[PDB]
Structure formats: C-alpha cells, structure tokens
Amino acid sequence: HHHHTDVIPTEFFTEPGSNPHATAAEYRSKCPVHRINVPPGADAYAVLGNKVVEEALGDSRLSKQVENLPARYRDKAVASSLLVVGNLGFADAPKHTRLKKPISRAFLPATVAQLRPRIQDIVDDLIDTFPENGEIDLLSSFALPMPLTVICEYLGIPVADRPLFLEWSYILSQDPLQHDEAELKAASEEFTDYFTKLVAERRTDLRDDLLSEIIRARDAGVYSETELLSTLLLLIIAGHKTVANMIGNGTALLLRHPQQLEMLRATPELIPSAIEEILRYEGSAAWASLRVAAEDMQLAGVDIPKGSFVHLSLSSAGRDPDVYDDPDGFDVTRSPNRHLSFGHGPHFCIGAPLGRLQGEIAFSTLLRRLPRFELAVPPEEVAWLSDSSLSRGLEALPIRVGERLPR
Ligand code: HEM
Ligand SMILES: CS[C@H](Cc1c[nH]c2ccccc12)C(=O)O
C-alpha cells in the first residue's frame, strides 16, 4: 500500500467528452473526495459520492460568498462576473434569506401551476415555426427560446430582446476564473445598462410581475442596486439554460432509447417520470455552483484547508450504485427516483416546480404534435458542449421534424 497524490485534471470539469461517466465511476470507487485542478493552480476538491454530495450541498462550513475566496480568485471573479456577487445563489445565512424572500412566493408550485396555459401557447407558437417535413436544430429552434420566453414574460422583460439575453446568459454562466475576462466584463456592463434603463421605465408604473416585486425590494432597501441586477441575471440564466439542456439532453436520450420513446408516446402520463430520469442521468447542472471552505474542515476523511474550492459533481451523484440499481441504465419508469440534480438543503432550486412544469408541457407537446421526429445526423455526430460553466448540454441537436399536427 502506497499513498497517492493524484489531482483530477482540469479537463474532467472543462472537457469531459461524450461518456465521462466511466471516469467519474473509477474516481468515485476509490474515494468520494479528490484533489481537482479547477480552476488551474488552485487548491480545490471534487466530491463524487451521492451521500457526500448531499452532505456538502447543505454544509455551512462551505461558503457561497465570493469574499471567502483567496484574494487573487476573489478579485478576479468580482472584476469580471455580475453573477457571483449579489444574489441568493452566492449567499450564506443570513444574507441568503434576505435575498430569497422577495422572489420565493413567485416560484411556489400552485402559483407556477397557473402559468400552464401561457407555457402551452409559447410551446405551440414555437412548434408552429418548425418547417414541416424539414430539419431544425432543436436547441436554437425550441429548447433555448421556449424557457427564455417563459422567464422573460414572467419577469415582464420584452421577449423581442431574446438574442441579447441568449448571448449575455451564455457568457455570464462561464467561470470568471477560467473564461476570457474581457468578454465577461463587457457582458456584465451591457446587462447592467439594459436593466438599469428597463427598471427605471418599469418603476414609473409598477405592473404586477416579479420584476415589480424585485424593484419594490430595491426601493425598500431589501436589495442594493447590485443585488437587483445580480438577482435578475441568475433568474435569467438559471431560468433558461437548465430547461434548454433538459429538453436537449432529454430528446437525445429518448432518441437513443427509442422503445422508451414509444412507451412515452403510448402513455403520456409517464412523461413526468421520464423527466426525473433525464435529470438523474444527464442533469442540466453537472456541477453545483461556487463553494469554498470558510475554515479548515474535514469532509468524509479528507482535510480541506480554508480557502479551497469544493466542486460537487451532481453528474457523479446521479450514477452512484449505493443509491441506484443499474445506475448507467436509462429507465423512464425508475420509481421512486430521488436525485441531487436540483441540489439539496438551503440552496435547493427555487425553479424546480417551474422547470418540471416546462419539461412536462415541452415533451407532451413535442410527442403529440410531431408523431415521428428523428435525428437528422448519425448519433456519433451529436456533440456534447465543453465550457467552463456548470452545464451538461449539447452543441446542437439536428432533428427531422416529420409530420406536424396542429396545436
Ligand atoms: C431542469 C431545470 C433546472 C435544473 C437542473 C436546475 C438546477 C439547479 C441546481 C443544481 C441548483 C443548486 C445550485 C447549488 O446548490 O450550487 C439550482 C439553484 C437555483 N435555481 Fe435551478 N435548476 C432548474 C430550473 C430553474 C428555473 C426554471 C429557475 C428559474 C428562475 C431556476 C432558478 C434557481 C435559482 C434562483 C437557484 C438558487 C437557489 C438558492 O441558491 O437558494 N432554476 N438550480
Ligand atoms: C442550469 S446550469 C448553469 C446555471 C445555473 C444553474 N443553477 C445555478 C446556481 C448558481 C449559479 C449558476 C447556476 C449553467 O451554466 O448552465
């Protein structure tokens, strides 16, 4: 027996590949917690075991506040990214409760459930734009614009400014410690200027939306200007990137498992179950967001010094054989199917009801209206996107639409 000091390469995070699951399993079988080179040169750990991910997700010794980063990382993150500085996503107790309170009611299940008719119209309006018996990229035609439209209408942001939101979201979702600095600063400043002007307009006649609730909190001193702007940015990013990748990953997985797609066609009621299995197997967030040791700490026997990054692999947690029978089998009937793909504890996804509802309406409507859509390319041509973001998602999903039935 000899002690081993190997550090998981950066690429395990930034450039995983088509099947990174075997690699994660090999690391996980040896230990739940490992040194990882993310960002490059940093003291950082990856957590791969389901149960230890679950503990870490809720462990208050891990801070989400950017001021708890070592100075060289803190200074770089703050100068670049409006995302990391002032929202509930990057807040510990008690700031987390203050930053969460103005928006939490808007995301309750029974409230979100009233968006069903408008979501259905958005989905139908998008499918109406498909070329019948043509070819689409499902991401650009549907998976991106559907949830962007939903969160835009729900905030009371003009749908017309779609491509600005798509670009700002993609750039500002990237890790400011790994991604081009100039790009993120420009995105931060362009987002700031747009929303400064929109808020000033919306203030002069508050409308009864979420943006009006957010403006009210700002005007009452519950949010600073930065916290209003950072909060809007999280809601926009987390609002559409995750749902986009759920529809993209999910459609690819169903086409890769055609008998289970036929099952969903025959019995549409199974679609919520299929959504949960999509989230376990290829969850839109492969990693939980920024966490740093606030103090010297031990997690599952490994000593993590103060200031170390701790990266939680939701992807690895989804395939843990301690939790799931046949973890690498995709089975839409898996039940119950408890997973960590929406996180756990105080930062549990506020969007989960809204994401689950959009998933059900999206897949129900695609399967009903396009009775036989298929891949437009050989499956080996379907590429997973590599970037510094928390995402697990496709570059593109070429689809032959086939016949298109009316809404
Ligand atoms: C399938 C869809 C989605 C997935 C897979 C997903 C995943 C997550 C995950 C893993 C976290 C926890 C991050 C952590 O602990 O570091 C989370 C938090 C959050 N997500 Fe979602 N998300 C979903 C859709 C949404 C939607 C539609 C919204 C709309 C605004 C949303 C807004 C939130 C926000 C605001 C947080 C931070 C909550 C907090 O820190 O207290 N998400 N999401
Ligand atoms: C949907 S995955 C991710 C965006 C995201 C989801 N939840 C978060 C909490 C904090 C910070 C960022 C995120 C992406 O980049 O695709």
Ligand 2 atom closest to the CA of 391, numbered from 1 = 16
User: With helix as H, strand as E and coil as C, how does 28-39 read?
Assistant: HHHCCEEEECCC
Ligand 2 atom closest to the CA of 90, numbered from 1 = 10
Per-domain boundaries in the chain: 1-407
Ligand 2 atom closest to the CA of 83, numbered from 1 = 11
CB 404 within 8 A of CB 369: yes
CB 358 within 8 A of CB 284: no
> Which ligand ends up closest to the CA of 54?
1
Find where tokens 């008998």 sit.
259
| DSSP label of 267 | -
Cα of 263 to ligand 1 centre, how many Å? 29
In order, the DSSP letters of 79-119 are HH-STTTSSGGG--TTHHHHHHTTTTGGG-HHHHGGGHHHH
CA distance 223 to 217: 6
> Which ligand ends up closest to the CA of 354?
1
CB 369 within 8 A of CB 154: no
Q: Which residues touch 5 (CB under 8 Å, ≥6 apart)?
A: 35
What's the start-to-end Cα distance of the chain, in Å?
A: 65
| DSSP label of 142 | I
Helix and strand numbers (H, E) in the chain are 17, 10
Query: Solving technique for this entry?
Result: X-ray
